[PDB]
Design a protein around this nucleic acid. Structure first.
Lengths: 52, 207, 49, 198, 171, 52, 175, 174, 195
RNA sequence: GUCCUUUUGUGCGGCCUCG
């Protein structure tokens, strides 16, 4: 889910646009693409998104 | 150890241009510096010095009939869409048509699967972003005239109530800065508002 | 160099009699030597001396 | 002199410099006089007699320097001129496929803002090269189709709708300088498609 | 520590804004230029009291430039740390060199050399923490620290705390 | 750090290592360190020099 | 490099029971991480029985080398490769070599060796706390979820359980 | 940017030891001295504020501004979003979170009683306002703890510190 | 969340390790009719940025690692004079390259590469072991380590009287002669590369 | 493929010009 900062600053240019509105992504498949989940965490640390 | 690695076409292109074959391919849109303008072809230079080329069928719009020289000039920079890349000779072909330069926005293969992407929230957010791009600025109008008063319709009627029949007041109109409503007292507690359309206006506040 | 023109000079650096001259135009061409900079990094014919 | 007696504290004594040792209290801004860590400033943390330890301001790490090399300077005011190979706000090529703009400069390190927004701290030697792009290459085109050169002020319409003056151009990215964004001294990166010219 | 102070600002207005809404536009400009700023002399300005009824006076026309200069006086709530003061904090990040806490908008850094030795940093812990036998301090944990030094920047303030003394550490 | 100590020890003894066993007989290295490093450092053998 | 890795370890020399527990823990961790490789091994080499037992024995031998003999990964990979692979003769007398482990797996075994000592310290501290509690009768839940505990999260959960249910003894020893 | 009402301070030759900022020595500098001047030049005392008083004031001012901007028609997030400036929004959000997680007195009447107790008391008539703010903010429980945290209170031994702390704990909502 | 973070960090760590292993696992270029691992004799050329003013600088390194006969060409590289000078340089008895390496800063390097390759092919400049004869190879050289080498103070101390482009050519030749040692010489700077 | 450009002395002395 997106915070207000994420609601604004998540532009197509940004690397975080890949997972801006992601859902129903199983945990078992996360290890296949570590960069995706690391980018999600780094976006969370910026205060843009929240991983639920 | 393995044998000495010898660069291929993609590695040579990346070495000499610092643009990968992923970030520079078919369909992308880039700004190019025009260098030559001719009757049938146009020669441009990109940011990384890759020599481009555009043909007569890709310079002008189908409904256009003017000569290419009249339309563009040397030294001008324009947007163009890539139609082919020659990774060995460092040459590319481009098109300046509207159908290629502007419509192709979604250049990334984002997996918008309905079960894996929140389509409705994205649509609502995009609709709200368009509804915020529709925002505009507006301000009141000031007119200098002895019988002009910055009053509402009811305010003008109340102002004309204290005055006898035949006196005239002028107020701004609700239809826009190009319209003026003139209110005059027809009878006691009876007033007529007449809208006047302005033409050849020097300014919004001007008459 | 200066902002004026140099095309009116001859090979010997001097203008010839009978030529029209306007303000600032160069009529005597003279140069003085200068110890060259690090341009010996490679400037085939375009290193200033 | 300072002492518990008030009458002694109102006296001035002239003392030779050969019998004086500086007193460094914990939590004081001090600037290094001489050594490998010359012109480094920070706050004193530990005073182990002759050896003094302090958290630096530039490197932001603890540095151990002898007390003879310290002067109590409440402000750094360090000038980075005549150092490295990079002026402030230079567009530096970090590596083969990475580029950025120098945000802050230091004696033996630099702060670089990437095109995607990530900040890096690197030594000067690790930087691949400096991009000396030609003026014709340093031109971009806004969303309307109007040309925007360096020094042209533009203001966005998407996103946070910020505004700035163009500082550098790289591909489609515009490096803008702004007054109100104090977070990175006004330097924020946006694509040219996001801005409209004023 | 929070305080009430009487502050003043100089506001310059371009002649294109010389309209009836001049006072309100000056008020909003003052609010945007004062709310949230950080000045080393004063600390942090958080809010301005009576923000919609501030007197702006009469502006003076600058000779040779046309623009008017306004002197706006206002009362605002200001927060500024002091050397040798003990305040509460919340840990925001854990690192081998020390932990970073947040005291409102101010971020305070405490190095390991100002941390007691029994609070050994455990990077294997989830989340990583500086833990002892009876104490465990991690991200989001309440901590009471004493401000030792303050570093002033152009528009920023950097503070350094310590927890090596009594009645400090985990709370 | 061990590499620099080894280089200094070799330069003390004469900057030439005749045999692998001299890393133990000359006390240059300890037992386990030599056991690890013995087969990864080599001494070029010239048959014309060593007729025996 | 081993000294640099083990510089943070308070005490590296484990007892025999703790060492066997360490070997079992590393075997289980590798089994968890290399599930797809083990599935490929089982499917494509169905004719050979008990290959996973050979994998367990090989992993235990590598842990033995790294911990007791202190061999680094290149030395094991070059001069101890026979313990990292299994050979057999098929029905057609075909010599077949199966590579159970690679160099990256040796590095992962080094990493797990380094990782387990934090778990061991946490478990020792938890057991010491339980000893200072000095229950009259052993708590079946504590021993039940302490014997099977294999991550520090479960140890933290047991610590929370102990400090809650026996808070009075903790207060007496000492909110 | 903003300039204080105190000016002058020109060059001299003497140097004083009461110039460095120090909470323990109660040396708050010229701009935070015990004696201040308002816009009219009249005498004014330094106004310290505890977290309860500060929270009440910021909430009152923010809700007044929000009501005024909305044509005179409670949530911290919306109230923070009322203000302008992204950095300002972040700063006010951080202050709101800090005040909320350490609010000793969330009630106006409790804060009023605390202020009256800490002001009208005979012992507190000599107490510095910074000491009052520190006592009402830190929520100390012991005289020794208060002396260790606040070194200034050590020299003022004519204050009934223990009973005042117990009254503060009583007024504090558990 | 912490567990998945740790697992993904492990996977990314191993991916980066494998990528770096692919980067540094390169033997020196093997000259023909010689056993693998033999150090070749290298000649490297580069004009720099490719501008009008920029001249071509050459450096010849023998199989013993000693730089020999750095030269500067004082003519336009698109002319016949440059071709004659390069033909005289290569065919000199004191210089016997096994490979010719070329690298540069932009697309102008392609013209130099094509010019040198065409000259070598047309003049039939063969490897001089001083039987079967083989033409000298012309390749593009990856200059990941040369650009950091040319600014390093160690290189400046090693060659005080030489310009930066000469150090770039020496870095390219050293990279051809031993990629591993050239990566090692970067020290702390090798973590900033594109791995 | 080629096109591409930037700035000025000082200090005295003398003779003049308009009041």
């Amino acid at each position: 889910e997106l915070t207000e900062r994420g609601k604004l600053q998540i532009e197509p240019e940004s690397p975080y646009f890949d997972f801006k509105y992601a859902k129903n992504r199983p945990i078992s498949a996360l290890t296949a693409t570590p960069d995706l989940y690391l980018r999600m965490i780094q976006a969370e640390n910026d205060g843009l998104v929240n991983i639920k | 150890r393995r044998d000495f690695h010898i660069l291929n076409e993609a590695e040579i292109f990346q070495l000499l241009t610092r643009e990968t074959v992923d970030s520079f391919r078919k369909g992308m849109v880039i700004p190019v510096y025009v260098r030559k303008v001719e009757s049938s072809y146009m020669s441009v230079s990109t940011q990384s010095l890759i020599a481009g080329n555009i043909q007569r069928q890709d310079i002008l719009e189908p409904n256009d009939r003017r000569d290419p020289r009249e339309v563009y000039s040397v030294g001008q920079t324009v947007r163009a869409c890539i139609l082919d890349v020659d990774y060995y000779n460092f040459k590319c072909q481009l098109s300046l048509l509207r159908q290629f330069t502007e419509n192709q926005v979604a250049g990334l293969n984002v997996n918008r699967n309905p079960k894996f992407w929140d389509i409705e929230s994205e649509n609502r957010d995009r609709q709200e972003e368009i509804d915020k791009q529709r925002e505009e600025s507006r301000e009141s109008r000031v007119i200098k005239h002895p019988f002009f008063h910055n009053m509402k319709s009811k305010e003008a009627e109340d102002y004309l109530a204290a005055r006898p029949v035949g006196d005239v007041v002028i107020r701004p109109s609700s239809k826009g800065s190009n319209h003026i409503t003139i209110s005059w007292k027809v009878a006691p507690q009876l007033y007529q508002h007449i809208d006047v359309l302005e033409e050849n206006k020097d300014d919004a506040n001007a008459i | 160099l200066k902002h004026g023109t140099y095309e009116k000079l001859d090979e010997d650096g001097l203008i010839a009699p009978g030529v029209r001259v306007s303000g600032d135009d160069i009529i005597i061409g003279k140069t003085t030597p200068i110890p060259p900079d690090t341009e010996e990094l490679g400037q085939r014919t375009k290193y200033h001396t | 002199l300072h002492s518990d007696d008030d009458t002694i504290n109102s006296e001035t004594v002239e003392i030779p410099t050969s019998d004086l040792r500086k007193i460094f209290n914990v939590g004081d801004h001090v600037r290094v006089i001489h050594g490998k860590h010359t012109d480094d400033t920070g706050l004193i943390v530990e005073v182990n007699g002759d050896k003094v330890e302090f958290i630096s301001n530039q490197t932001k790490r603890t540095v151990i320097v002898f007390s003879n090399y310290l002067i109590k300077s409440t402000d750094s005011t360090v000038s980075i001129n005549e150092s490295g190979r990079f002026e402030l706000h230079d567009l530096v090529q970090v590596n083969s496929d990475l580029v950025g703009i120098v945000i802050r400069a230091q004696k033996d390190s630099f702060d670089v803002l990437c095109s995607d927004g990530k900040l890096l701290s690197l030594p000067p030697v690790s930087i691949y090269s400096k991009l000396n792009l030609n003026p014709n290459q340093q031109i971009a085109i806004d969303s309307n189709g109007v040309e925007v050169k360096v020094g042209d002020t533009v203001r966005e319409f998407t996103g946070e709708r910020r505004q700035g003056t163009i500082l550098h151009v790289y591909r489609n990215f515009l490096f803008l300088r702004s007054r109100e964004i104090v977070e990175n001294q006004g330097v924020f990166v946006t694509s040219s498609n996001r801005v409209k010219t004023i | 520590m929070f305080f009430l102070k009487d502050l003043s600002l100089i506001l310059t207005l371009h002649p294109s804004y010389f309209g009836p809404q001049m006072n309100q536009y000056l008020r909003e400009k003052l609010l945007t230029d004062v709310e949230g700023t950080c000045t080393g002399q004063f600390g942090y300005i958080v809010t301005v009291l009576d923000g919609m009824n501030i007197d702006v006076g009469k502006g003076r026309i600058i000779p040779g430039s046309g623009s008017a200069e306004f002197e706006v006086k206002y009362r605002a709530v200001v927060w500024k740390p002091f050397k040798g003061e003990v305040v509460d904090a919340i840990v925001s990040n854990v690192s081998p060199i020390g932990f970073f806490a947040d005291v409102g908008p101010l971020n305070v850094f405490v190095s390991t050399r100002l941390i007691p030795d029994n609070l050994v940093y455990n990077p294997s812990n989830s989340p990583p923490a500086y833990m002892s036998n009876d104490e465990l301090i991690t991200k989001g944990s309440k901590v009471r620290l004493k401000v030792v030094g303050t570093r002033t920047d152009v528009n920023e303030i950097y503070a350094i705390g310590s927890i090596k003394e009594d009645f400090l550490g985990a709370i | 750090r061990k590499a620099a100590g080894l280089i200094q020890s070799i330069q003390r003894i004469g900057s030439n290592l005749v045999n692998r066993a001299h890393l133990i007989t000359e006390q240059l290295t300890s037992k386990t360190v030599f056991l690890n490093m013995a087969s990864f450092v080599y001494i070029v053998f010239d048959p014309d020099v060593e007729r025996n | 490099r081993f000294q640099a890795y083990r510089k943070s370890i308070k005490n590296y020399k484990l007892s025999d029971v703790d060492y066997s527990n360490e070997r079992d823990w590393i075997v289980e961790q590798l089994k968890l991480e290399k599930r797809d490789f083990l599935q490929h091994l089982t499917q494509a080499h169905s004719s050979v029985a008990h290959l996973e037992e050979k994998f367990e024995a090989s992993v235990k031998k590598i842990v033995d080398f790294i911990a007791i003999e202190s061999f680094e990964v290149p030395f094991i990979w070059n001069h101890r490769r026979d313990y990292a692979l299994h050979t057999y003769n098929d029905d057609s007398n075909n010599t077949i070599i199966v590579k159970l482990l690679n160099e990256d797996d040796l590095w992962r075994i080094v990493q797990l060796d380094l990782d387990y000592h934090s778990i061991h310290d946490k478990k020792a501290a938890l057991s010491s706390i339980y000893k200072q509690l000095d229950l009259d009768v052993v708590d079946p839940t504590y021993e039940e979820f302490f014997g099977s505990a294999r991550t520090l999260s479960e140890l933290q959960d047991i610590d929370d359980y102990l400090t809650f249910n026996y808070s009075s003894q903790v207060k007496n020893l000492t909110s | 940017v903003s300039t204080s009402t105190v000016g002058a301070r020109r060059r001299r030759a003497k140097q004083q030891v009461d110039d460095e900022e120090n909470a323990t020595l109660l040396r708050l500098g010229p701009e935070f001295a015990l004696k201040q001047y308002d816009h009219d030049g009249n005498e004014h005392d330094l106004i310290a504020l505890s977290l309860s008083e500060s929270r009440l004031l910021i909430r009152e001012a923010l809700k007044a501004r929000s009501r005024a901007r909305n044509g005179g028609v409670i949530d911290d997030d919306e109230l923070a979003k009322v203000t302008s400036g992204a950095v300002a929004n972040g700063v006010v959000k951080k202050t709101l979170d800090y005040l909320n997680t350490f609010a000793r007195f969330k009630d106006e009447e409790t804060c009023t009683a605390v202020d009256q107790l800490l002001h009208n008391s005979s012992d507190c008539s000599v107490l510095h306002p910074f000491e009052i703010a520190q006592l009402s903010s830190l929520g100390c429980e012991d005289v020794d703890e208060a002396i260790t945290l606040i070194p200034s209170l050590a020299a003022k031994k004519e204050v009934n510190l223990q009973r005042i702390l117990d009254e503060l704990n009583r007024l504090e909502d558990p | 969340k912490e567990s998945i973070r740790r697992d993904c960090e492990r996977v990314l760590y191993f991916q980066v390790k494998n990528s770096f292993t692919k980067k540094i696992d390169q033997a020196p270029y093997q000259p023909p009719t010689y056993a693998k691992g033999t150090i070749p004799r290298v000649l490297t050329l580069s004009f720099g940025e490719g501008n009008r003013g920029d001249a071509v600088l050459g450096v010849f390194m023998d199989d013993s690692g000693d730089v020999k006969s750095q030269i500067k060409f004082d003519e336009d590289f698109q002319s016949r004079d440059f071709s004659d000078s390069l033909t005289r340089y290569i065919k000199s008895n004191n210089i016997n390259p096994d490979i010719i390496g070329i690298s540069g800063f932009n697309i102008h390097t392609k013209k130099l590469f094509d010019k040198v390759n065409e000259l070598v092919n047309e003049e039939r400049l063969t490897i001089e072991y001083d039987s079967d004869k083989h033409l000298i190879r012309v390749i593009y050289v990856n200059d990941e380590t040369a650009r950091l080498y040319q600014h390093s103070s160690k290189s400046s101390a090693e060659y005080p009287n030489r310009p930066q482009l000469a150090k770039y050519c020496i870095g390219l030749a050293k990279y051809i002669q031993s990629p591993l040692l050239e990566y090692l010489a970067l020290d702390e700077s090798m973590y900033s590369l594109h791995i």
